[PDB]
């Protein structure tokens, strides 16, 4: 069960189901090319590659390296607010 912030890399804040773009609050470093898993109740957990990331001002980022910054990127299946994201080994 969930004890600390070490256990995940992002918290989903929002998801645009028309465009596929998720809004994620970073908790630990992740970057384009990384594999992640989205999880939590109400979804089947799934993995994907992170293709490209941007901030809320539309700047592309080489990495989401700043704790609790809000970032955006395309996801491969729908998400609900407060689903979670972790790195996939």
Coordinates of C-alpha atoms in Angstrom, one line a residue:
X1 CA 0.0 0.0 0.0
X2 CA 1.1 3.7 -0.5
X3 CA 3.5 5.0 2.2
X4 CA 5.5 7.7 0.6
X5 CA 6.2 9.9 -2.4
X6 CA 9.0 7.6 -3.5
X7 CA 6.4 5.2 -4.9
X8 CA 5.2 7.3 -7.8
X9 CA 6.4 9.8 -10.4
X10 CA 3.3 11.8 -11.1
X11 CA -0.3 12.4 -10.1
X12 CA -2.9 13.0 -12.8
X13 CA -4.6 16.3 -12.4
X14 CA -6.7 16.2 -15.6
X15 CA -7.2 14.5 -18.9
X16 CA -8.7 15.9 -22.2
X17 CA -10.5 13.0 -23.7
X18 CA -10.8 14.7 -27.1
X19 CA -7.0 15.2 -27.5
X20 CA -5.5 12.5 -25.3
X21 CA -3.5 15.1 -23.4
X22 CA -2.9 14.5 -19.7
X23 CA -2.0 17.1 -17.1
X24 CA 0.3 15.6 -14.5
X25 CA 1.8 16.9 -11.3
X26 CA 5.4 15.7 -11.1
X27 CA 6.6 13.9 -8.0
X28 CA 9.9 12.4 -9.3
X29 CA 12.0 12.8 -12.4
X30 CA 10.8 11.5 -15.7
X31 CA 11.6 12.4 -19.3
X32 CA 10.8 11.6 -22.9
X33 CA 11.7 8.0 -23.8
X34 CA 10.9 6.7 -20.3
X35 CA 8.4 3.9 -19.8
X36 CA 5.7 4.7 -17.3
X37 CA 2.7 2.9 -15.9
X38 CA -0.6 4.5 -15.0
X39 CA -2.6 2.9 -12.2
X40 CA -5.4 3.3 -9.8
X41 CA -9.0 2.3 -9.4
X42 CA -11.4 2.7 -12.3
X43 CA -8.7 2.0 -15.0
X44 CA -7.0 -1.1 -16.1
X45 CA -3.3 -0.2 -15.5
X46 CA -1.3 0.3 -18.6
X47 CA 2.2 1.2 -19.7
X48 CA 3.4 3.7 -22.3
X49 CA 6.4 5.6 -23.5
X50 CA 6.5 9.3 -22.8
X51 CA 6.9 10.9 -26.2
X52 CA 7.3 14.6 -25.5
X53 CA 6.5 16.8 -22.5
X54 CA 5.5 20.5 -22.2
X55 CA 4.6 22.9 -19.4
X56 CA 1.4 24.8 -19.0
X57 CA 3.0 27.7 -21.0
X58 CA 3.7 25.4 -24.0
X59 CA 7.5 25.1 -23.5
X60 CA 8.8 21.7 -24.3
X61 CA 10.9 20.2 -21.6
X62 CA 13.8 17.8 -21.8
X63 CA 12.7 16.3 -18.5
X64 CA 10.1 16.8 -15.7
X65 CA 12.9 17.3 -13.1
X66 CA 11.3 19.8 -10.7
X67 CA 9.2 18.4 -7.9
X68 CA 5.5 19.3 -8.1
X69 CA 5.7 21.2 -11.4
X70 CA 2.7 20.6 -13.7
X71 CA 3.5 19.1 -17.1
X72 CA 1.4 17.8 -20.1
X73 CA 1.9 15.0 -22.5
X74 CA -0.1 12.6 -24.7
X75 CA -1.3 9.4 -23.1
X76 CA -2.4 6.2 -24.8
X77 CA -5.6 5.5 -22.9
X78 CA -8.1 7.6 -20.9
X79 CA -7.2 8.7 -17.4
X80 CA -9.2 10.1 -14.5
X81 CA -8.1 12.9 -12.2
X82 CA -6.0 11.4 -9.4
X83 CA -4.9 8.3 -11.1
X84 CA -1.2 7.8 -10.5
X85 CA 1.9 7.3 -12.6
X86 CA 5.1 5.4 -11.8
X87 CA 8.2 4.5 -13.7
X88 CA 7.9 1.0 -15.4
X89 CA 11.0 -1.1 -14.9

